[PDB]
Design a protein around this ligand. Sequence first.
Ligand SMILES: C[C@@H]1O[C@@H](O)[C@H](O[C@H]2OC(C(=O)O)=C[C@H](O)[C@H]2O)[C@H](O)[C@H]1O
Ligand SMILES: C[C@@H]1O[C@@H](O)[C@H](O[C@H]2OC(C(=O)O)=C[C@H](O)[C@H]2O)[C@H](O)[C@H]1O
Ligand SMILES: [Ca+2]
Ligand SMILES: [Ca+2]
Lengths: 896, 884
Amino acid sequence: NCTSSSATVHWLGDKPTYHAGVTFGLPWPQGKYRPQETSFSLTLQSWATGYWADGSLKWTAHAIAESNQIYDQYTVTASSLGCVKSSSSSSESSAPNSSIVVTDNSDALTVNTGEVAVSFPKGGNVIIGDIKTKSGKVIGANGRLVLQSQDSVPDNFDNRANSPIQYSNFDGNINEVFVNQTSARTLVTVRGNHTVTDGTDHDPWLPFVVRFYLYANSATIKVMHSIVFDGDENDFITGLGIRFDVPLKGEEYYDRHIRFAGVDGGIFNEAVQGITGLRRDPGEEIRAAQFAGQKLADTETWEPRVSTRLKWIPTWADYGLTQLTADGFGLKKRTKAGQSWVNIPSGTRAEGLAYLGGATQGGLAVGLRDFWKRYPVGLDISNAASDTGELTLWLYSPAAEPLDLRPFHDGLGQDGYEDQLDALEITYEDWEPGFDTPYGIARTSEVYLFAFDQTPTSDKLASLTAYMNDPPVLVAEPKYIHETQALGEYWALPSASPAAATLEDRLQFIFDFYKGQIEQRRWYGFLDYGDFMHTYDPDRHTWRYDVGGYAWDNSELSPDLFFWLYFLRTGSKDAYRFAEALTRHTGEVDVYHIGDWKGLGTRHGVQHWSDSAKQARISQPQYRKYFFYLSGGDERVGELLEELLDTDKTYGELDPQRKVRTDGWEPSPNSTVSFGLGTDWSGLAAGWLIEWERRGPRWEEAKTKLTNTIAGIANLTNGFVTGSGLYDPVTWTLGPPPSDPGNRGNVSISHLNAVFGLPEVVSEAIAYLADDIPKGFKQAWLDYCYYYHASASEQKDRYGVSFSKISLLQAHSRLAAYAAYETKNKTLALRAWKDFYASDGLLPDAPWNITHVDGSDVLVPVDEAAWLATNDIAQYGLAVIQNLAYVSDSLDDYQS
Amino acid sequence: FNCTSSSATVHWLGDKPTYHAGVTFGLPWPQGKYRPQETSFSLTSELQSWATGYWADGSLKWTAHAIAESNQIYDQYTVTASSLGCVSSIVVTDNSDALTVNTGEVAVSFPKGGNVIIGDIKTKSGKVIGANGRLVLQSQDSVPDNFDNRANSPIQYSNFDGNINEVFVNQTSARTLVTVRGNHTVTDGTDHDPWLPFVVRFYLYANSATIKVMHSIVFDGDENDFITGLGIRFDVPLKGEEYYDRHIRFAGVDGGIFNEAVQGITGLRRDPGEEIRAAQFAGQKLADTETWEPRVSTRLKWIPTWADYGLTQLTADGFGLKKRTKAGQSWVNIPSGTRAEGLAYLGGATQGGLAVGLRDFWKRYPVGLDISNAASDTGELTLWLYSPAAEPLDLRPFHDGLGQDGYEDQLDALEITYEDWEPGFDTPYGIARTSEVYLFAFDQTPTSDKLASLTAYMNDPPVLVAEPKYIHETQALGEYWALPSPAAATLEDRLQFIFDFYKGQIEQRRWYGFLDYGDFMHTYDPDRHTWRYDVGGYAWDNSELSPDLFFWLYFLRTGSKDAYRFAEALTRHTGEVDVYHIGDWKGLGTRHGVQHWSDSAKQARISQPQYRKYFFYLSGGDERVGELLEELLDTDKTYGELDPQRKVRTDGWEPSPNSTVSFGLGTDWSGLAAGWLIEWERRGPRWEEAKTKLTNTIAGIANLTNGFVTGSGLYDPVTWTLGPPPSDPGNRGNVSISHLNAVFGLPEVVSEAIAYLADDIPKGFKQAWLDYCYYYHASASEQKDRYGVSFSKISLLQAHSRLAAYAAYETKNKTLALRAWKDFYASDGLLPDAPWNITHVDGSDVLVPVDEAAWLATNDIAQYGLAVIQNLAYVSDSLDDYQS
Ligand SMILES: C[C@@H]1O[C@@H](O)[C@H](O[C@H]2OC(C(=O)O)=C[C@H](O)[C@H]2O)[C@H](O)[C@H]1O
Ligand SMILES: C[C@@H]1O[C@@H](O)[C@H](O[C@H]2OC(C(=O)O)=C[C@H](O)[C@H]2O)[C@H](O)[C@H]1O
Ligand SMILES: [Ca+2]
Ligand SMILES: [Ca+2]
C-alpha cells in the first residue's frame, strides 16, 4: 500500500544569491522504495544513482531548474505508487514553468533551455556550433578546443640559440556525442581527440571528454573538461584552451565591451573604442553609459569635437590576462599585431572570468573555477575590432614555461631491485626504470559559459564570477545520511564525554591546519591543486617536497576517507571543499586511466607519478564513493569508477610484490595472478561493490568477483592472515598463495593491509550480502580484527607464530572497535581506546598546537606542526571517527 | 696668514643603519669661502675629499666625501673645513692583462679587454670565490602575432657578451670607482652586428666585500630587435666541496631566506645526527662522515643532487621558484610567494662564495635569479635584469598612425587624445636605463641573518646628507625654497597630502617594471577610475610641468627619507628612459604619452638638466648622472636637425644647413641654460664653452627689445649668439607668450644664473626677467602700455604666482606680493576649498580596490607644490596680510 517519507536538503554554506540549476543526492533506507515505482516532489526531476542488494533505491539524484526564487531549504517527499493507486482523488496535471527541448539529427544535436539554444556537431573540429539567446540572436559560435605543444626543450635559456624548437597546434576532434536528456537538466557528453592543424604530422593524441550541463531556464552552462596524458618524452604541452568566436559585425567599436574579473569581486571595465578620459567630453550621460556597457546615443547628440575625431581614438583589438603564478597576474592590451602591447594596472589573484560582447550584439563570458589556484592560466580577447572576436580561456598558458612531465631524475645509477630498495631506505622512494611515467594520468577542469543578449552589468559579472568560484551545493542532513546507513555504518554524528569533546576539537585543529597549509605552502597548480604533502622537514621548515616518498601524499593512509567522513559527520562547507578538491586530484592525477597499468595509481612521491609502486590502494574507489553519491552521481567520477573494474587485469602485467616477495613467483601468461588480501583486494572489492550497487553494465560480473573472492578468503585456512592469493582471471576465483598450494596454513602480516579502506569495504560488503554472505567470512574478518593486537601467545596459539612487524596500533584501534561492537565485548572495546590513547600515532599529550616561523629561516612566514605527518592525522582521525561510532559507550568507562 | 675654518654635519637619511659598506656624501659651502686644493678636511681623522661644484669665483660650492666600511656607525658625521694658513687604504695594482682593486676584504681583477668584465674575486685569505663576471644579453629577430602564430613564424635567437673597449679607474684610498664601457657582441646563435652599448660602474670601498655595480644601457636596436634576456653572470668554483657542503640561498619575502644545500641531509628517512642536520641548515661544513649514522653516510649516492635553481619574478605581485637535478629531467616546483627581495648566493662552507642582487628587484620586473651546475666543479650564478621567462621586450609603437597624414591630421588627433603623433618619432632609439646591482663576497657560506641583512641594505642603501638648514644657508642649491602662521601650516599639510597620494598610487596602480618603475601618470579617468594609461598624452607623465622640481625641493625643505627615495626613483627614470642619449635627437626628451617614447614633441624641457641637479650634488656627484648631464651639452645641435615648433609656427621659417636655428626663450632655452650652468659649475671639459653660450644667450635676451616677452630667438651654432626671431630682423619688438614658458625650470635656472654671474651680468637682463615675472598677469592696461598688445593666451595663473613672488621679494613690493598670493589662492590650479581628500573605490567598478583624487591631475600638483614652496620662501610676510 502507501509509503511516503521526506528528506530536507540545505545549501552547503550561506543561502546563494544566484544559482543556475543544481543537482543533489538523497539516500533512502534499505528496502523502502522500489525503482520506477516511486515518485518525488519538492517543497521534481529524479533518477537513481545506486541501489540496495534487494533492488530498492539506495541513492537518487535530483535536479532543479534555474529560478529567481531561492529557498533556505528544500524538502523532497518520496511516495510509492501505492499512494496514488489507492486514493480516488482527481488531481491536476500541468506542464512545468520551464523545460528543456532537444532536436536531434545526422549533422548535429541542439539543446534549448528556454534561455539559450546550443548546438553540438556530431563530428568535426568544432564542439559547439553556436549559442543563441531566447530571441534567436547568435551570441557565440565555433566553440572549439585548442592544444599547443613542442617537440623538445632547451637545457636552459642560453641553449635556445643552439636548440631549435618545433611548435605544433592541435584542434579538438569529435568522435562521439551522447545525451542524457531530462526536462530540468540535460547533459551532452562529447568524446574526442586532438589532431594537428599547424606543424608536422603528429598522431592524434590527448584524449578528451567534455561534459556540458544545461539546466532549464538557464543561460549558464557548466563544463567538465577532462583530458588524459598519452604523450611521450618528446611531447611538451605548451598551451591548452577553450575558444569561442563572438560576432561583433554591426556594433560600433564604442559599444563593444571587454570585461575581466579582478581581485575579490573586482571588475575591469573597458570598451574597444574608449570615449572616457579624452581631452573633450562627449557628454556625462554618454561616458556613464559606456562604463555601464549600454549602447551609446546617436553621434549627432554628442559634443561634436569628439564624433568628428573618432578616427583618431585608437581601437583595442587584443587583450591578455596571464596568471603565471598563484600570486600575481599581468594584464595587457594592444591595437593589433605588429604593434607593441600596452600594460594595464594588474594585481594578485584574478578570479578567472572574461567577457566579450556588445550592447546590441550581445556576447559571451567564459571562465575557470578556481582559476589562480590552477596556474598557469589565462584569458584572451582577440580581434575585437573585426567582424569576429575570439574569446579564449587558457587552461594552460603559453606564456608559461612548457609543461614538462618527465622524470625528475635519471635513476642515479640504480641497477636492479637491490639498489632500488637500498634507495628506499634513505629517501623512501621506490624507483624503477620506465615506472616514473605520467603516461595515462588525467585532469578534469570545471569551466563555465555565460550567454548574454546584451552586455550585462558589472554587478552581474562579479556575481557570476562568485557563482563560478563557489558553485552552490545542496546536501542532505548528516542525521538523515547516517540514519539511512547508505554511506557506511562506521561513522556517526558528534556525545557528552569531555574526552569526546577534546577529540572533536582535535579533528577541527587538524582540518584547520591542513586547510591553511594549502595557502601557506602554495600547493596550487594545473596538476597539483588538491593534493598535499606527506612528511615534514623540521630543520628546513618545509614539507619534504624534494625527498622521495615524503612529498605529494597521493592518498597514503587514506586521507580521502578521513576528510570525507569528516564532512559527513559535520556538514561543514570548508570540509566539503577541502575534500572535493582532494578527490578531483587524487582520483584523476594520481591514477592511470589507459595502458597496461590502467586502474592502478602511484605511491606518494616527488612527482605524482614518480614512484614505482603502482597499486590499487591508490586508485581505491572507496575514496570516491562518498563524493560519487553526494554530488548526485557526478558523471566523470562515474566514468572513473568504471575504468577501475579493469584493475584486476593488471596483476598479469605487474606484481606489486615483485621486489620483496620470497616465494619465486612471477606472472606468466594464461596463469593465475597474485594479489594481496588487504591493500590490493580492498581496492578491487570496493570497485566491484560499487558496480554492483550501481547496477551498471558489469554488475553481474562485479557481484560474482566480489562474492567469489570473499568466499575464497573464507576458504583460506588463515583467512586474511594469509596475506595473498592466486586469482583465476577466467573462473574469477581465489585460491591460496604460491607457497601454500595445499591450503595447509600461511602467515604473512602487514601493517599496511587494513589502512587503505579494508574495514570500510568489508563492512559495507557484509551488509550488502546479508544472508548470502559466504560461510565463515565474517569470522575470518573478526579473526583479523581481534588477533592483530592480541598477545603474542594468542597469535601463536591460533596461527603457529606471533605477529612480527605489527605497527600502526592507533590506526588499527578501530578494528578492535569494530569487533568489540559486533561481539558486544566491553574488554575489547577497552582495548580499542587503549591503543588509541596509549600506543603510537598522535598521543593525547603530543604538542597539539602550531608554531609560527619567520625571518631568515624561511622564504615566507609559515605555521608548522613538526610533531605530525599526514600518515598520523589520517589514521588518527579515522580512529576517532570509527571508535566513537562503535565504542563510545565504553569511552567514559576507559577514562575512569 | 689667516685661518678661515667651519664645520658641517651630516646625518643618516632615516634611521641609523646597523650595516653600511662605505658611503659617499655631498656637502655645500658658502660662496667665496674655501679655495679648491688649498682647503683641508677632517671627520668626527683625515677625510677623502674632492670637488663636484664650484662658485663663479672658483671657490668650493659642492664637495664630495667618502668613508670606508666600518662597524663603528655614528649618529652624526662632522666635517671640519680649514683654509691653507690654519694649523684603511685601497691598493690598486696594474698588470698587462688586467687591473686589480684590493679593499683589505676583497681583491677584484678587471681585464682591460675581452668579453670578461671581472677576472676574479678573492677574499682576505686569497681564495677565489667568484670568477668571470660577464654580461649576458639574448635577443630574437621576430615576434609571433599571438600564441597560435608560433607554429608559422619561426624565431631566431641570438646570444651576446659584453665586449670591453675602455676601462677607467678613479682611485682614492677610501674608494675606487672602476668604469667599464663597451657593446654587446654575438657569441652563439644567429648573426648580428654589435649593439646595446653599456657602461658598468664598480664602487669599491676600503674594508668592504660589498660592491655597488651601477649598470647602464642604451637601446640602439631597431624594430627587429626584441630583447629576450638581460643579465650579469659569475662562475663560482666548487670543485673541492662535498655536495652536502654547497649552499644555495635566495632572499624571499620581506626578511625571508630560502636555505638549501645541493645534497640535502635533512628530511631523509634516516637521521644522520641532529648536530649534523642543524649544521647543514646553518651553512657550516658538516662533520666527518665517520661521526654520522652509517645508515645515512653509506647511502649518499642515492640522495639526489640539485644542480639548477630558478627564481622568476614575472609580475610585481608573484614569483616562481623551482629546482632541477640536471638537464634532461623535469623541474621540481618549490613553495614560492609574492615579492622576492632579489638576492641569491652560491658557494660552500670551505670554498666560500658569492651573492649577487638587484636593488628594487620585484619593482623592476620581469627579473630573475639562477644558480646552475651546482653539482659540477664550477657553478654559475646569474642575475637577470630582464628574464627570458617573460615575454620578449617589445619597444615598437603601440599604434600604426591611425592613417594620420601630415601635420593637419596630427594636430586634429592631438585635440582628442592629447597626443602629438608623427611617423618615425614614436621610437625608442637611444633611450636608457640604469640598474643598481650589488655583489657580496664571502670566505665561507654566511648566516641567513647576514644574507637577510645584505638583502635589506641593497634595498635601502644608507645615505648621509647635510642639514636642510645648512643647505639653505649656503645658497648652494637655489634660493627659491625655505624651511617650513596657521595659513602656511595647512599649505604644508596639503603638500604632505599630495606626497602621500602619489607614493600610494605607485603601489596601487602597480607602476612597477624594468622601464616603467620611477614614473607616474598625468591625468585620471573618473568614469573608469584609472589613470589615463591608454589615452595619448594623459598616460606616463615624463616630467610634464616639473614634478621633478617639486619632489626634490620637497626633500630639501624636509629631510624626509620617503621624499628622497620617491624623488630618487623619479630621477632614475625620467633622466634615463624619458630622454635620448645617442642619435639626431640626442639631448632631447619626449613629451608625456602612452609609451615613454611615443609622442613626437622631442624637446629639452623633458631632458632639462635642472631636474637632475639636486640629486647630482646631494648624491656626491653620482657619476652616471654626471655622464648624463654632459650628454645634454649637445642639445643645441638638435635645433638644426629638428624644429620643436614645426607644426604650429606662423612665420614660414624652417631649418636650413649652415644657418641660424630657432628655439624658444622659455621652454627650450630653460633646458639649454641649465645644461650650460651645470657644466660651468662643474668645471668640466666643456666649461669655457658652456660659460660662453650661457653668457651670450643671456646677453642676447637682454639686447632683444621686449626681452623674454619676445617668444623666441635665432641662435648661431658656430658663433654662439642670440638674435631676434625670423619675424623681427630689425629688433623692433615681438610679443609671443606661452603658458608653458616659465613652468619647466626657467625661474629656478634664471635665479641661479643671475646670482652666479654676479657683477658680470649683462646690463638689463635681470630687469627683462622682472618684466616677465611682473607683466605676465598684470592688467591688460599695463601690458598694452608696456608692449603695445595685451597678452592673448595667458593661463596657469597659480603656477605663475611664484614669479610675481620672485619679483615682489626682489623689488621690495608689497602690492605685487598680495597679487601673487591672490593668484595662488584664487585663480586656477588647485583652489583652497577644492575637495582635498581621497575617495575609496572597490566592488565591480574596478579590477582592484583603489584610492582616487579625480579633482587633481599631475600638472596641478607639481605647480601647486612649487608655488607653495616658492611663495612661502619669497613672500611669507605678505601671507598674513593676505588672509585678513
Ligand atoms: C612492497 C612495496 O614496497 C614499497 O614500494 C612500498 O613500501 C615501502 O613503503 C611503505 C608505504 O606505506 O609507502 C611502507 C613499507 O614499509 C615500505 O617498505 C609499498 O608500500 C609496498 O607495497
Ligand atoms: C609645439 C608643441 O606642440 C605639441 O606637441 C604640444 O602641444 C600641446 O601640448 C601641451 C603640453 O603642455 O603638453 C600644451 C599645448 O597647449 C598643447 O597643444 C607641445 O606642448 C608643444 O610644445
Ligand atoms: Ca598526487
Ligand atoms: Ca616616462
